[PDB]
Ligand binder design. Structure first.
Ligand SMILES: NC(=O)C1=CN([C@@H]2O[C@H](COP(=O)(O)OP(=O)(O)OC[C@H]3O[C@@H](n4cnc5c(N)ncnc54)[C@H](O)[C@@H]3O)[C@@H](O)[C@H]2O)C=CC1
Length: 419
């Protein structure tokens, strides 16, 4: 009922925005548990810390204790906002940085700070297409077109669909914000220039979408693999099953080395390698990925032309993160090798200290399989991707892994699209 006579978009009508939010926020607060009241209060005081923490937690090792009360806030904020789901779409607004669209070209013209550079905006148009932008942590927004200057170059005009958990909160009763639950992504649906207060901003029209992404959800992940790839396991020829099994159990080292640059062990044969590759690849073509899905990979430095002892690989120095972002952002990288990925965001013991975390949008219809359906892959959550695809690099986001086992280092989250 609270959405009855509001529009989908309040535009600049700050007064209508307020009336709607007030009645909504009052009812929602009286529906909260004390633990939820407290956690939403914590989100007002330090939303940044909480959101940063959600990232650390999801990419952690299994035995990650973390910080107790922020585990609580993560849960309570999530259950809180689910008590305030929209009954019809709501457009919302917020100023945004270059970073969140993986864009590092200045959008301002050099001549007039009020005027957007034409070639910049053209590259931006290319860059934001064919990409779902994952939004980490919670996202709080506003109800109307901002009326004040921004130092940021972009205005996002974001459509929240029906049933989005989206709660009215805040200290300023005449400018209540909207608190959006975890787990969502952004898909652009338009680009234009808007002029607010004499200045031009790049306006991104976008839809808020939900991609399948299990993060730490082990029960859901495996249930998905079983349902979608047990028949696949049934149909494997003997040799296909054998050589998938060889690959998985340690054969990958020699197989991907060979795919990468043709290396053969002296006791190894060329023909054995080619036969193994042909049986694995043929297997990976038998049942296309049935729905868009995020998968993850702890990547070694060699995958970006870096050695473990290369100086450029020290991401604890600000300068090295910048030159890496300079080098790979927007780039398409061919992948000659099979790609071992995991559908869980969890760090993995054998690869705990790798600094490069792939977060891959794996499209419907890709030649890949949930191989851990096979017997004796308890605790394995692998999707294996056919060789010869490519990475479109969408974004690079740093976070700091404080853990002793993780390597007490900054690490780079590489959002990418398989093409
Ligand atoms: N790495 C991961 O996140 C996952 C690993 N696994 C399991 O781990 C084992 C595979 O270990 P990995 O080291 O991931 O195998 P891999 O053959 O992909 O990696 C071997 C080494 O070669 C490098 N490399 C890989 N692809 C390359 C390319 N295109 N160009 C240049 N260098 C490249 C890697 O950085 C790594 O140092 C398998 O048993 C698999 O089941 C399973 C799921 C995910």
């Amino acid at each position: 009922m609270l959405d009855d006579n509001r529009p989908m978009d309040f535009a600049k009508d700050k007064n209508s925005a307020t009336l709607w939010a007030k009645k909504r926020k009052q009812v929602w607060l009286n529906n909260l548990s004390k633990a939820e009241s407290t956690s939403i209060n914590n989100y007002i005081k330090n939303s940044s810390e909480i959101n940063s923490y959600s990232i650390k937690k999801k990419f952690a090792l299994d035995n990650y204790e973390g910080i107790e009360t922020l585990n609580e806030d993560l849960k309570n904020i999530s259950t809180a906002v689910k008590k305030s789901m929209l009954t019809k779409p709501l457009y919302v607004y917020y100023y945004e940085a270059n970073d969140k669209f993986g864009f590092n070209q200045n959008l301002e013209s050099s001549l007039d700070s009020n005027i957007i550079d034409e070639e910049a905006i053209n590259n931006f148009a290319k860059k934001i297409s064919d990409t779902n932008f994952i939004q980490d942590g919670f996202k709080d927004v506003t109800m109307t077109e901002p009326d004040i200057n921004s130092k940021l170059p972009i205005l996002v005009h974001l459509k929240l669909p029906t049933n989005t958990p989206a709660a009215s909160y805040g200290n300023d009763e005449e400018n209540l914000r909207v608190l959006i639950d975890q787990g969502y992504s952004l898909k652009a649906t338009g680009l234009s220039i808007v002029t607010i207060k004499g200045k031009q901003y790049a306006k991104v029209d976008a839809d808020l979408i939900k991609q399948l992404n299990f993060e730490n959800d082990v029960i859901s992940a495996s249930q998905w693999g079983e349902e979608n790839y047990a028949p696949w396991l049934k149909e494997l020829t003997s040799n296909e099953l054998r050589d998938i099994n060889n690959y998985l159990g340690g054969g990958y080292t020699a197989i991907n080395k060979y795919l990468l640059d043709g290396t053969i062990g002296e006791n190894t044969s060329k023909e054995d390698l080619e036969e193994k590759i042909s049986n694995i690849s043929s297997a990976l073509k038998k049942r296309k990925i049935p729905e868009d899905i995020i998968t993850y990979r702890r990547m070694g430095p060699n995958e970006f032309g870096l050695d473990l002892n290369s100086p450029d690989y020290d991401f604890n120095k600000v300068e090295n993160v910048s030159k890496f972002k300079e080098k790979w952002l927007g780039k398409t990288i061919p992948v000659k090798t099979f790609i071992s990925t995991t559908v869980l965001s969890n760090n993995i013991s054998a690869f705990a200290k790798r600094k490069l975390i792939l977060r891959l949008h794996l499209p419907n219809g890709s030649n890949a399989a949930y191989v851990s359906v096979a017997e004796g892959y308890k605790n394995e959550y692998e999707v294996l991707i056919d060789h010869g695809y490519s990475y479109k690099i969408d974004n690079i986001t740093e976070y700091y892994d404080e853990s002793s086992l993780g390597g007490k280092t900054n690490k780079l989250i590489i959002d990418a699209t398989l093409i």
